[PDB]
């Protein structure tokens, strides 16, 4: 198993899915078409701001 | 000034060369959905009007 982690805007969470496009999906973190994993995200406005 | 949605405006774009990358590459758009066309291939495609 590979665990990947990063911080993004709340509006960008929708780009972290297979087949997505946009600045994050196209130029930061691209998921494969047949992705087998799970995407876990939580608000961090208490730590990262 | 934009139009009221009950009286939505329409403009014909024609007899011209487009570059949809100028639009899709901009970060200001909060939503850029496409139906029956893909935002990337949209710049390789051509239309009557």
């Amino acid at each position: 198993v590979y665990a990947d982690s990063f911080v993004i805007r709340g509006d960008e969470v929708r780009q972290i899915a297979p087949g997505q496009t946009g600045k994050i999906a196209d130029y930061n973190y691209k998921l494969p078409d047949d992705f087998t994993g799970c995407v876990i995200a939580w608000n961090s406005n208490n730590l990262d701001s | 000034r934009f139009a009221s949605v009950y009286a939505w405006n329409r403009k014909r774009i024609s007899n011209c060369v487009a570059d949809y990358s100028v639009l899709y590459n901009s970060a200001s758009f909060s939503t850029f959905k496409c139906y029956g066309v893909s935002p990337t291939k949209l710049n390789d495609l051509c239309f009557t009007n």
Side-chain angles (χ1 to χ4, degrees), chain B residues 33-47:
Chain B
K33 289 292 195 290
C34 295
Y35 305 93
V37 173
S38 180
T40 55
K41 287 177 180 280
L42 171 59
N43 225 25
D44 304 331
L45 192 58
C46 182
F47 313 106

Side-chain angles (χ1 to χ4, degrees), chain B residues 4-20:
Chain B
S4 286
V5 70
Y6 85 96
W8 56 271
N9 180 255
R10 170 164 282 190
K11 184 183 295 275
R12 177 174 169 254
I13 300 295
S14 287
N15 295 313
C16 64
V17 61
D19 184 2
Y20 299 95

Side-chain angles (χ1 to χ4, degrees), chain A residues 14-21 25 30-37 39:
Chain A
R14 62 177 64 97
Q15 293 192 26
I16 314 304
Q20 287 294 345
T21 64
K30 182 73 182 189
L31 286 176
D33 315 314
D34 60 347
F35 183 53
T36 61
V39 176

